[PDB]
Structures are given as C-alpha cells and as structure tokens.
Design a protein around this nucleic acid. Structure first.
Length: 189
RNA sequence: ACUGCCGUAUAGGCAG
C-alpha cells in the first residue's frame, strides 16, 4: 500500500565472518538507524528465508518509501558494513505479491525466569514457585533467529523471527524499531 | 535460548 518501495541488501561471502554473523550485525545496525529515524513505517523481510532449516538467508529486504531508502543508504548505520554487502536499487515492488507479517516471536525458554517474576508478584518462595511452574513449561521455537547485543540491557539475546501466512492483501499497521511487524504487512517476493 | 515488563496466570502478549 504505502510501502511500495524496497531495497535489497545481499551479504558478501567473507573468509573471516560467516553469513549469520554479518546478518546479525546488519540487522543490529538497522535497528540503530530505525531508533534514530523514529517512526514505524519501515519494515524488513528475509527473501531467502529457508523455513525448513530455520535460516534467514543472506538477503535483507527493507520496505519503506523511496526517500527513506535513499536516506538509509547514505547513513552511518552502514559504516563498516558497506564493503560486506551488495545493494540493489531502491525500487517499486513487483506486483502482484502476497503479503505477510514478519514478526518477532518470543518463548518461555527459561522456567527459572518465570519463577523469579512470580515470586516478585506473589511474594512466593523458590519452592512454591517451582511447584507451580515446572521445568516442562519451557518451550523451544523452531524459527530462524538473529543474535543481538542490547545496549540498554547488557545482554546478548536471540531474536526469533517468523514470516507469517501469505495473505492476498495487506492490512494497515506499523513496524517496530527492528522493522518487525506490530501489525503491518510487507510484500513478499 | 539472556534480562526484564504486562497479565491472576504456569494462559497468552511485550521490551532490548
């Protein structure tokens, strides 16, 4: 709809850095750009997604207005990265395409963590908490992910990404500062 | 496979 432009970024193979690491860094710098930019009008997708193998592939697509794309290309978030990437031209998307949400998915991967929260919210003990929240509560996602380092937290975390069911038409909605759906759809091709 | 947040929640959502 309003996001009828896109830019493709393809990773260049490198002897010192495997593709997954270049992708994490690319995605992380995008996040930094999007925070600075502000707004909720820029989306991403991973056109070379390999769902069978939960791999994102070596392509990052930015979905936005033509102007944003030309700005994003000249901006410092890409510093140190440009030599590791190949860029397409900011372009109008093909048509027709299906649309899909590209979303962050989170999992209760750590029962102990849910327990510290529970204790804090019900003044419970560890033994009480463990009785109510067993270790089987743990869920593992079968999804591709990037590994990120937060600046505000200190943590390294995995950010799991799901490319949702193909839809014929898009619905109104925006995107987080990681370019992931908070309702918005992007064209898939 | 981290830390936390919302929620009565172990349901389910969210932040970096």
């Amino acid at each position: 709809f309003t996001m009828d432009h896109y830019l493709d970024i393809r990773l260049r193979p490198d002897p010192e850095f495997p593709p997954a690491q270049l992708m994490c860094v690319l995605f992380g710098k995008l996040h930094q750009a999007l925070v600075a930019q502000g707004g909720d009008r820029i989306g991403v997708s991973f056109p070379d997604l390999d769902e069978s193998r939960s791999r994102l592939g070596e392509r990052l697509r930015i979905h936005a207005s033509a102007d944003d794309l030309r700005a994003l290309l000249a901006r410092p978030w890409l510093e140190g990265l440009r030599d590791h990437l190949q860029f397409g031209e900011p372009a109008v998307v093909p048509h027709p395409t299906p649309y899909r949400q590209v979303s962050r998915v989170q999992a209760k991967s750590n029962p102990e963590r849910l327990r510290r929260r529970l204790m804090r919210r019900h003044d419970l003990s560890e033994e009480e908490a463990r009785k109510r929240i067993p270790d089987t509560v743990a869920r593992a996602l079968d999804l591709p992910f990037v590994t990120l380092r937060s600046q505000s937290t200190g943590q390294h975390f995995r950010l799991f990404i799901r490319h949702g069911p193909l839809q014929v038409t898009a619905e109104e909605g925006g995107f987080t500062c990681y370019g992931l759906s908070k309702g918005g759809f992007v064209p898939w091709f």
